Amino acid sequence: ATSPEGIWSNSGALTFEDPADDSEILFAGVRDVTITPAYEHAELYTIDSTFRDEVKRYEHNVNVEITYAKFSLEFAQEWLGGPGATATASQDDSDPMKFNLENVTPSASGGFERTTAVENVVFPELPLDSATYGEYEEYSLTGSGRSVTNLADTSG
Amino acid sequence: ATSPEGIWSNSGALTFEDPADDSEILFAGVRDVTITPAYEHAELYTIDSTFRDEVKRYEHNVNVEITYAKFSLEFAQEWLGGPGATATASQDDSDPMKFNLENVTPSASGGFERTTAVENVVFPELPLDSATYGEYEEYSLTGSGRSVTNLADTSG
Amino acid sequence: ATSPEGIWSNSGALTFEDPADDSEILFAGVRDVTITPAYEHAELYTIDSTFRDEVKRYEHNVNVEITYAKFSLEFAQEWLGGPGATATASQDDSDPMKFNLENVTPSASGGFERTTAVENVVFPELPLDSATYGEYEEYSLTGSGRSVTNLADTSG
Amino acid sequence: ATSPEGIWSNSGALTFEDPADDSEILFAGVRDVTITPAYEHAELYTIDSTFRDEVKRYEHNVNVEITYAKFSLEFAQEWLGGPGATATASQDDSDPMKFNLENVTPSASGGFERTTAVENVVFPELPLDSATYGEYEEYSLTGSGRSVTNLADTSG
Amino acid sequence: ATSPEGIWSNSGALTFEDPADDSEILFAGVRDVTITPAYEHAELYTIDSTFRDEVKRYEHNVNVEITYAKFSLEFAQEWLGGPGATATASQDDSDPMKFNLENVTPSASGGFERTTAVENVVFPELPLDSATYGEYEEYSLTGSGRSVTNLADTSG
Amino acid sequence: ATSPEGIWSNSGALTFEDPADDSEILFAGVRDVTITPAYEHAELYTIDSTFRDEVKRYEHNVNVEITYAKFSLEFAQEWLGGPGATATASQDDSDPMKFNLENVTPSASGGFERTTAVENVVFPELPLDSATYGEYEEYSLTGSGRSVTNLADTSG
Amino acid sequence: ATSPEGIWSNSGALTFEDPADDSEILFAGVRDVTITPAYEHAELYTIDSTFRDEVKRYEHNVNVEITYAKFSLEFAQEWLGGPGATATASQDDSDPMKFNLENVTPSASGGFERTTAVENVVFPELPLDSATYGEYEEYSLTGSGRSVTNLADTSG
Amino acid sequence: ATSPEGIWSNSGALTFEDPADDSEILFAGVRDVTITPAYEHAELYTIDSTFRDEVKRYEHNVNVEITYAKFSLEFAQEWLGGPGATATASQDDSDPMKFNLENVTPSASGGFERTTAVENVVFPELPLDSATYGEYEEYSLTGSGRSVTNLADTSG
Amino acid sequence: ATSPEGIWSNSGALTFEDPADDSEILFAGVRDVTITPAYEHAELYTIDSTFRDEVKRYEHNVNVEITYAKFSLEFAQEWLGGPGATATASQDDSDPMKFNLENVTPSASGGFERTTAVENVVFPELPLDSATYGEYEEYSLTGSGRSVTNLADTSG
Amino acid sequence: ATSPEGIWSNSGALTFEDPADDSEILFAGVRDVTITPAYEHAELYTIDSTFRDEVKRYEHNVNVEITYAKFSLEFAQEWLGGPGATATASQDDSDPMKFNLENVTPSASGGFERTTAVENVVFPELPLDSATYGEYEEYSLTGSGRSVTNLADTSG
Amino acid sequence: ATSPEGIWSNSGALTFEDPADDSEILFAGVRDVTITPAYEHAELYTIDSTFRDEVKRYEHNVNVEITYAKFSLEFAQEWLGGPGATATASQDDSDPMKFNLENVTPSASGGFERTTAVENVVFPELPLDSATYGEYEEYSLTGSGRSVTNLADTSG
Amino acid sequence: ATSPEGIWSNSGALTFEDPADDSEILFAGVRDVTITPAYEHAELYTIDSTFRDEVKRYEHNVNVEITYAKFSLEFAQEWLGGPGATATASQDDSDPMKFNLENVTPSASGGFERTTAVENVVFPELPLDSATYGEYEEYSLTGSGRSVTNLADTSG
Amino acid sequence: DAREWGTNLIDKFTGGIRSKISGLRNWLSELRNIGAEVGIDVPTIGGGG
Amino acid sequence: DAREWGTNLIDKFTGGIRSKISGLRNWLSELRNIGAEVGIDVPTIGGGG
């Protein structure tokens, strides 16, 4: 297998896609990105022992959190509009906008190119304005994806 | 679609309006502004599977929080008075003063002019006095609007 | 209406009064003063909408918190004694001492003089001693008033 | 009444007494001392007013907390022993050692001498050893007295 | 017995193995490693006595937490795949990948070589991407092993 | 009684003993120690008064916590083994290893020699590995003893 | 445009005026004069590029620093007095004396006459006495103006 | 007003008085004397403007720095003794000796006589011995006065 | 490749251009010129090795600092005016004047002609007046460019 | 009172004594000697006034610094040995050697003989070897005494 | 072993190589050259002893700093272009140009020839222009190499 | 006791030994040598007194710093190699080369011969090349010894 | 004169830049260090769960 | 004398530059609280709920 290698944050390229089209939603100027697939663990014990008998995964989730400093009207209007539409105002409906997400990062010494892809990321809240005196507006998204669709070396 | 661009916080222009008139309520000396439309997400799972099946929006609101350093007697007496009234003392009634809020910000190199507008913002608490020795008084509001009425590029 | 203006913390004059007399209770050497009228907000929704239907004020309060560095025997003995009396020892009775409070401040360029007055401020606890090595004793009061009785420009 | 005045922490003299004798229990080398009489306050609201109707005191105690840096064998063995006894080991009995406490301070420019006295202070826990590399051992007590027995100007 | 001795963190060598094979899973570039065998302790008390009567262990586990800065595609795809399998995507199944873990360290002046080994470590969440502006990606695992299988001096 | 005096942390000499033997368990390289005998206090009130009627000790323990930087195989293997045994692996049984503890500290000017001794200290979790990049391994134990068996001046 | 030209320091003509009157405040005998308008800069960087995305001005001030060797009682008593007042003693009030400053200077070959004017210069500290053995007293002022009101060629 | 004029350092006449008496404390042989009244300044900025909204004074003090080359026993013993006393040894009390200071100086051409007077100057440290091989002992004081009590032309 | 050769400072020709026009802004009389392209470096270390794993670049800028002795009204008024404008007074706006800079130097023996060109140089502060008694006014600029656009031998 | 008078550095006689005996420790060849009694000052300021309310002393020490050019084995071996002992090697113990110090100086015209005495001077670091090519070895001590025990005219 | 010997600076011959080729990068006219291998050290101390328990090396790097007075276009263009390329303009990429460095110096009496070689020297900033009136341009590099690859006597 | 005496720097004889053998490491041509045993001091203060209660030593080290002008390949290769080895390249390991150091120096009139010896001196960095134009290479070492093993008069 | 200006200008620059070189390496600590709440206070795994 | 005071006075003056560049520690502490402190209350939906 491929040797483990350092990854440099600034080498990453994050992208968002509409799952209806696979069309890109314009997004840029990231500063921090965390992508964490997770499960809850049921550690199960037994009748006559202090030791763990079995352990089981449940309730899968992909935590996505992104800090970014370039505003996108398209991303914000996609979020307002829900799935398959854009809006300039809050929509009174129960379907959230679902984003496909992909992040591509070279290894620090070029040993592999790591691609991570996540399906159906939803964001419970969207920061529109994030003004602080003497600073550029910086925006924090916290959301949850359904699953990791791809984690591979995508280098030739 | 419009290219994502940086936004400089100090380029912003926040305004408050009475929804009964569309008249401006005098407010100035902003330092921080965060505007965040949100929904409760019901994040739904099935019998068979560890994966999420569906996610649904419910209770909507817009979180508004503002830090500012110029005191306004009008804004304070409007808040005390409740809807369509102005008062110099706390009122023993159940109607909170509802403010229409708008903020206008040019993008950092003139790509767009982002306008955000929020209906029926209410504030649970109003800091009247906020004195710290050797500092100007600084005031923090936290409140909730009903919906985003506008998020658009308002440039020519 | 009057233009919003900066307020300088050190321009403030805080006074306490016995509500039985309107007589001053000696108090001095403040370093912080926060006065915040507050209500709880009930946000309410209908059966067929994600959007808020109504929002309502309840359970009114005025959070008062003061940090100060000159000890007052009169203030402390008034607190111990309860309404209309002073004591040199704890009293075994259910009525707390209620203080009327007033803070007066010029605006930074003298555009207005903001007066805030609060009725029936009570303090659940009174710091008698607050010694730290190499420091003057600094005392923190947290309390709650019934209502704001006055918020006005009191300049000529 | 007496003008409020600054109090310099280091001018204080704390002392502990056995309530059985009024004899001094040897204690020294304090660095912080906070004494705070407190009551639980019930803030009582009424039928359909949003305003507070009444407020009542109900459970009195005096919070005492002391940081000190000279160890006392007497104080520690009195605490172990319980009322009217001294011990070198934990005692399996339900009576805590009750200390009478007094603190005396001149005001910073001699306007008054404040004496605070507290009856039946008890400490839930006693730090015996409190070692950190490159530091003197420093000990923090937290406890509760029954009442303030004296708060007066004791100057001539 | 062997004299207690300092241990230097950078002298450590952590390794992960598949328990199906005892084959190494490629993992490298750790910065922090903490391994902590633990039990729930029931602290039992009797009638009348204030002293603890007995204390009992139950529900054993080994807390493992590792911070590392070289990404491993093998480790990540083993975690996704579950036991005895490797996957480029999240798996909708209940079995977590169980790793055998071993860490080996010389003592700081060669008195001993401490080997710690832990069976069936599982991790509830796997950070895939962990980007921050101007930083190498830094990945933190938290997980639990079933037991410590070896803690011995493995020096010659 | 002996005058209260400063205690210098680095003058301490901590030791551990097996309560089955009174034999020493090798332990060294301490950096912090806290020993705190504690009880819960029930504060009780009468029917007719806001003042405390009585206060009572219950549920005694001695909080012991130690930070140390020299690893001991004996201490760890004792902890694994439980009472009267050592083990190189986790044991599936319900009896924890109970340690007797003693710490001896001269006072800073040699006025006394404070000996503190604690029976049946148990640690719910044992840190085996505690590596951080560019640091010696540092271990924190938190545990609970049954009682203080001795607190005395052992000088003579 | 005007050819750049040398400027000779001893050709300068510094003057101070009261902003209430435009009346001159007597001041003479300068030896150094530095006037530097400044802004705080903030620069945008993101994961997208190693190059600067944006740069923005904010916190504007004019650094004024003057060294002079003729003492002025009028200047010192204006500084003590605060706005629109003169005093022979320190004043216990929050308003600093704001000075209008102007400096006029011919270019070295008479190609232009540079006039620099600065509004609302305030000086945090005023040297009253600056005696050194065998020297005339020499005074350094450091202060902040609000804005440059004029920078022009004032030659005919 | 009086023309600004040069001041020659060797024309100065510094004196110290005990504020309890107005009696002179013998002091001589100055070589440098700096007196500088100062305030802390706070400047207000908001997103309204890049320019300063407001500026305000707070902590007033008068920096006094004196270098002198004749030792005074009276000055040193006054400093040791605190207010209203002289001592031959360090005093274990909290009150520093407060000195009143006056410096009188003719202007270089006799146009005025500047008198500067400062109340309640205190010095955190006193140089007793200041020996350097081949030099007379030279002593530097540094201290803080409360306020300037007089700055005037005291000529006839 | 071209032989390395000495460069004589007085042979350099420095020019500033407006990036909106490529039109020259009059500047003259340089004495010092330092141009330094710089990146922030991040180095990776892990417990695998005492040696550096990786090194990476971020936050590119070109430090430009110039000392010059001929004042330019055009340059100063360009700096005040911001992009595409000149002003005789401070402007209350967010955008600094960005200059293109080029410096051209023959090598000392004419082996090459080095041209250095830097885009979008901004200066946080501009010295307007820099008078020292008995000296020509000398101005120092410190600023930062976005990138080096050209570094070449421009000889025939 | 005694007239202030010059003091000539080369007239001084410095001696060190062991506080256990009052016995002299041989020391010679001083070049510089500074003795400075000092206290930490705390100043009280509040919202009541821009002027200082109070000023108070706390941490007393005497800064002693000596430069000398004759090496003493006795002084060095006393410093190594700690209180009441001499050593030819570093000692692994917590007590520094405390020296009594006295300096006796006639005034320049014989008006007085100034004796300064300092108790319990301790030196954190001792220079043993201080070789510079072409120079005699020169040693600088910096240390802290507890208090000044005498400052008097000791002439007949 | 070889007798230690003087080294004369002007006898040194510094060279740079591209690590992709071992091809020489033209560089000349050094004035100062400092090469310094360094490690971070960590020292262990515990309550056991005032003496050091252990000392350990970690972050290795070789500090390289060079002052030189002949400009090289090849060196500058290699630095701009990153690994394996020259460029005439700044590059928006994450990899710094890594240089191999070697310096060869005969000893002053010819006793040995000292060769020092360093791998992967990187420079965070490159001075392009370093002009000062009346002086040749002089350039200072500061950088970090990964390791010393050779330090030997290379004489026959 | 031995009379204190002047010491001439050029009379000193510095030697380094390998602590594994007591074999000499060739080193010559010193210009400066400083050896300074040191401890950290902790001082105790409490509100009982303004004077120091206690002072204590910890963190013993011996600061060794040497400037020298004859290069030694043996010393440099010993440093690279670590304990018990020599190397011609940086070694990727945790253990610094520990040197025993001894300096022997006659007093200026031959009254004594000071021998100073220091154990386990380590140097965080080693200067290899230290070229300055028109100078011999001059090398500065800074290091920490564990203890002074001998400070004695070694004359007959 | 040269030793005046030529030093004091560098005091202006370096007095500032020393706080960059240290301050940046402080933020490279802060993000880990105050990040440590994630392993100290955040993980209810420590018993609260 | 204008060096002797001036250099270290000008270093004193760039104590002004050190305001924001030391304040950077505070700003990047807070900007980590946003990722590390927030996570303390957020899981109280579990830890309390």
Coordinates of N, CA and C in Angstrom, one line a residue, chain A residues 1-10 30-41 43 45 49-58 60 62-63 103-105 108 112-114 116 146-153, chain E residues 26-28 39 57-61 69-74 76-77 79-82 88-91 93-98 120 122-137 139 144-147:
Chain A
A1 N 0.9 -1.2 0.0 CA 0.0 0.0 0.0 C 0.9 1.3 0.0
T2 N 0.3 2.4 -0.3 CA 0.9 3.7 -0.4 C 1.4 4.2 1.0
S3 N 2.7 4.7 1.0 CA 3.2 5.2 2.3 C 2.4 6.4 2.8
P4 N 2.1 6.5 4.1 CA 1.4 7.7 4.7 C 2.3 8.9 4.4
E5 N 1.6 10.1 4.2 CA 2.3 11.3 3.8 C 1.6 12.5 4.4
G6 N 2.4 13.6 4.7 CA 1.8 14.9 5.1 C 0.9 15.5 4.0
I7 N -0.2 16.2 4.5 CA -1.1 16.9 3.6 C -1.1 18.4 4.0
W8 N -0.9 19.3 3.0 CA -0.8 20.7 3.2 C -2.2 21.3 2.9
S9 N -2.7 22.1 3.9 CA -4.1 22.6 3.8 C -4.4 23.4 2.6
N10 N -3.4 24.3 2.2 CA -3.6 25.3 1.1 C -3.5 24.6 -0.2
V30 N -12.2 29.3 0.9 CA -12.2 28.5 2.2 C -10.9 28.8 2.9
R31 N -11.0 28.6 4.3 CA -9.8 28.9 5.2 C -9.6 27.6 6.0
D32 N -10.7 27.1 6.6 CA -10.7 25.8 7.3 C -11.7 24.8 6.6
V33 N -11.4 23.5 6.6 CA -12.3 22.5 6.1 C -12.1 21.2 7.0
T34 N -13.2 20.7 7.7 CA -13.2 19.4 8.3 C -14.3 18.5 7.8
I35 N -13.9 17.3 7.4 CA -14.8 16.3 7.0 C -14.6 15.0 7.8
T36 N -15.6 14.6 8.6 CA -15.5 13.5 9.5 C -16.6 12.6 9.4
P37 N -16.5 11.4 8.7 CA -17.4 10.3 8.8 C -17.4 9.7 10.3
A38 N -18.6 9.5 10.8 CA -18.8 9.1 12.1 C -20.0 8.1 12.2
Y39 N -19.9 7.2 13.3 CA -21.0 6.4 13.7 C -21.1 6.5 15.2
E40 N -22.3 6.3 15.8 CA -22.4 6.0 17.2 C -22.0 4.5 17.4
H41 N -21.3 4.2 18.5 CA -20.9 2.9 18.9 C -21.7 2.4 20.1
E43 N -21.1 -0.1 22.7 CA -20.3 -1.1 23.4 C -21.1 -2.0 24.3
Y45 N -21.7 -5.2 26.8 CA -21.1 -6.1 27.8 C -21.9 -7.4 27.9
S49 N -18.9 -10.9 33.1 CA -17.6 -10.4 32.8 C -17.6 -8.9 32.8
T50 N -16.4 -8.3 33.2 CA -16.2 -6.9 33.1 C -15.7 -6.5 31.7
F51 N -15.3 -7.4 30.8 CA -14.8 -7.1 29.5 C -16.0 -6.9 28.5
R52 N -15.7 -6.1 27.5 CA -16.6 -5.8 26.4 C -16.8 -7.1 25.6
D53 N -18.1 -7.4 25.3 CA -18.5 -8.7 24.5 C -18.4 -8.4 23.0
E54 N -19.1 -7.3 22.6 CA -19.2 -6.9 21.2 C -19.3 -5.4 21.1
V55 N -19.0 -4.8 20.0 CA -19.3 -3.4 19.7 C -19.8 -3.2 18.3
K56 N -20.8 -2.3 18.1 CA -21.6 -2.1 16.9 C -21.7 -0.7 16.5
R57 N -21.6 -0.4 15.2 CA -21.9 0.9 14.5 C -23.4 1.1 14.3
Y58 N -23.8 2.3 14.6 CA -25.2 2.7 14.2 C -25.2 4.2 13.9
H60 N -25.1 6.4 11.1 CA -24.0 7.0 10.3 C -24.3 8.5 10.0
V62 N -21.8 12.1 8.3 CA -20.6 12.7 7.9 C -20.7 14.2 8.3
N63 N -20.0 14.5 9.4 CA -19.9 15.9 9.9 C -19.0 16.7 8.9
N103 N -13.7 17.3 -2.1 CA -12.5 17.9 -1.8 C -11.3 17.1 -2.3
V104 N -10.4 17.8 -3.1 CA -9.2 17.1 -3.7 C -8.0 17.8 -3.1
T105 N -7.1 17.0 -2.6 CA -5.8 17.4 -2.0 C -4.6 16.6 -2.5
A108 N 1.8 16.1 0.3 CA 2.8 17.2 0.4 C 4.1 16.9 -0.4
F112 N 0.5 10.7 -3.5 CA -0.8 10.4 -3.9 C -1.7 11.7 -4.0
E113 N -2.8 11.6 -4.6 CA -3.8 12.7 -4.6 C -5.1 12.2 -4.0
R114 N -5.4 12.7 -2.8 CA -6.5 12.2 -2.0 C -7.8 13.0 -2.4
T116 N -11.8 13.2 -1.5 CA -12.9 12.9 -0.6 C -14.2 13.4 -1.2
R146 N -24.8 12.4 4.2 CA -25.4 11.1 4.4 C -24.3 10.0 4.5
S147 N -23.3 10.1 3.6 CA -22.2 9.1 3.5 C -21.1 9.7 2.7
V148 N -19.9 9.0 2.8 CA -18.7 9.2 2.0 C -18.9 8.3 0.7
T149 N -19.0 9.0 -0.5 CA -19.2 8.3 -1.7 C -17.9 7.8 -2.3
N150 N -16.8 8.6 -2.0 CA -15.5 8.3 -2.6 C -14.4 8.7 -1.6
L151 N -13.4 7.9 -1.4 CA -12.1 8.2 -0.7 C -11.0 7.3 -1.4
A152 N -10.2 8.0 -2.2 CA -9.3 7.2 -3.1 C -8.1 8.1 -3.5
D153 N -7.0 7.5 -3.9 CA -5.9 8.1 -4.6 C -6.4 8.3 -6.1
Chain E
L26 N -0.6 0.4 7.5 CA 0.4 1.5 7.4 C -0.2 2.8 8.1
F27 N 0.6 3.3 9.1 CA 0.2 4.4 9.9 C 1.5 5.1 10.4
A28 N 1.6 6.4 10.4 CA 2.8 7.1 10.7 C 2.5 8.5 11.1
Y39 N -11.8 1.4 34.3 CA -13.0 0.6 34.7 C -14.0 1.7 35.3
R57 N -14.8 -2.8 40.7 CA -14.6 -2.6 39.3 C -15.7 -3.3 38.5
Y58 N -16.1 -2.6 37.4 CA -16.9 -3.2 36.3 C -16.7 -2.5 35.0
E59 N -17.1 -3.1 33.9 CA -17.3 -2.4 32.6 C -16.0 -1.8 32.1
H60 N -15.0 -2.7 31.9 CA -13.6 -2.3 31.5 C -13.6 -1.8 30.0
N61 N -12.7 -0.9 29.8 CA -12.3 -0.5 28.4 C -10.9 0.2 28.5
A69 N -0.3 13.5 11.8 CA -0.1 14.5 10.8 C 0.3 14.0 9.4
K70 N 0.4 12.7 9.2 CA 0.5 12.0 7.9 C -0.7 11.2 7.6
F71 N -1.4 11.5 6.5 CA -2.6 10.8 6.2 C -2.3 9.4 5.6
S72 N -3.0 8.4 6.1 CA -2.9 7.0 5.5 C -4.2 6.6 4.8
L73 N -4.1 6.3 3.5 CA -5.2 5.8 2.7 C -5.6 4.4 3.2
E74 N -4.6 3.6 3.6 CA -4.9 2.2 4.0 C -5.7 2.3 5.3
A76 N -7.6 4.6 6.6 CA -8.9 5.2 6.3 C -9.8 4.3 5.6
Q77 N -9.3 3.5 4.6 CA -10.1 2.6 3.8 C -10.4 1.3 4.6
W79 N -10.9 1.4 7.9 CA -11.9 1.9 8.8 C -13.3 1.9 8.1
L80 N -13.3 2.4 6.8 CA -14.5 2.4 6.1 C -15.0 1.0 5.8
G81 N -14.1 0.1 5.5 CA -14.4 -1.2 5.0 C -15.1 -2.1 6.1
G82 N -14.7 -1.9 7.4 CA -15.1 -2.8 8.5 C -14.1 -4.0 8.5
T88 N -13.6 2.2 -0.5 CA -13.5 3.6 -0.9 C -14.7 4.4 -0.6
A89 N -15.7 3.8 0.1 CA -16.9 4.5 0.5 C -17.5 4.0 1.8
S90 N -18.3 4.8 2.5 CA -19.0 4.4 3.7 C -19.8 3.1 3.4
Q91 N -19.8 2.2 4.4 CA -20.5 0.9 4.3 C -21.7 1.0 5.3
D93 N -23.2 -1.1 7.3 CA -23.2 -2.3 8.1 C -22.7 -2.0 9.5
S94 N -23.1 -2.9 10.4 CA -23.0 -2.6 11.9 C -21.6 -3.0 12.5
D95 N -20.7 -3.6 11.7 CA -19.4 -4.1 12.3 C -18.4 -3.0 12.1
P96 N -17.8 -2.4 13.2 CA -16.7 -1.5 13.1 C -15.4 -2.3 12.9
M97 N -14.5 -1.7 12.1 CA -13.1 -2.2 12.0 C -12.4 -2.2 13.3
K98 N -11.9 -3.3 13.8 CA -11.2 -3.5 15.0 C -9.7 -3.6 14.7
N120 N -8.4 -4.9 19.8 CA -9.7 -4.5 19.3 C -10.1 -3.1 19.6
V122 N -11.5 0.4 18.5 CA -12.4 0.9 17.5 C -12.5 2.4 17.7
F123 N -12.8 3.1 16.6 CA -12.9 4.6 16.5 C -14.3 5.0 16.1
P124 N -15.1 5.7 16.9 CA -16.4 6.1 16.5 C -16.4 7.0 15.3
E125 N -15.4 7.8 15.1 CA -15.3 8.8 14.0 C -13.8 8.8 13.4
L126 N -13.8 9.1 12.1 CA -12.5 9.1 11.4 C -12.4 10.5 10.7
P127 N -11.5 11.4 11.1 CA -11.3 12.6 10.3 C -10.6 12.3 9.0
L128 N -11.3 12.6 7.9 CA -10.7 12.4 6.5 C -9.9 13.7 6.1
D129 N -10.6 14.8 6.1 CA -10.0 16.1 5.8 C -10.0 17.0 7.1
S130 N -8.9 17.7 7.3 CA -8.7 18.5 8.5 C -7.8 19.7 8.2
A131 N -8.3 20.5 7.2 CA -7.5 21.6 6.7 C -7.7 22.9 7.5
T132 N -6.7 23.7 7.7 CA -6.7 25.0 8.3 C -5.6 25.8 7.6
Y133 N -6.0 27.1 7.3 CA -5.1 28.0 6.5 C -3.7 28.1 7.2
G134 N -2.7 27.7 6.4 CA -1.3 27.8 6.8 C -0.8 26.7 7.7
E135 N -1.5 25.6 7.7 CA -1.2 24.4 8.5 C -1.2 23.1 7.7
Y136 N -0.3 22.2 8.1 CA -0.5 20.8 7.6 C -1.8 20.2 8.3
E137 N -2.5 19.3 7.6 CA -3.7 18.7 8.1 C -3.3 17.9 9.4
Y139 N -4.9 15.3 12.3 CA -6.0 14.4 12.5 C -6.0 13.8 13.9
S144 N -11.8 3.2 21.6 CA -11.8 2.3 22.8 C -11.4 0.9 22.4
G145 N -10.4 0.4 23.1 CA -9.9 -1.0 23.1 C -10.7 -1.9 24.1
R146 N -10.6 -3.2 23.9 CA -11.3 -4.1 24.8 C -10.5 -4.3 26.1
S147 N -9.1 -4.5 25.9 CA -8.2 -4.8 27.0 C -6.8 -4.5 26.6

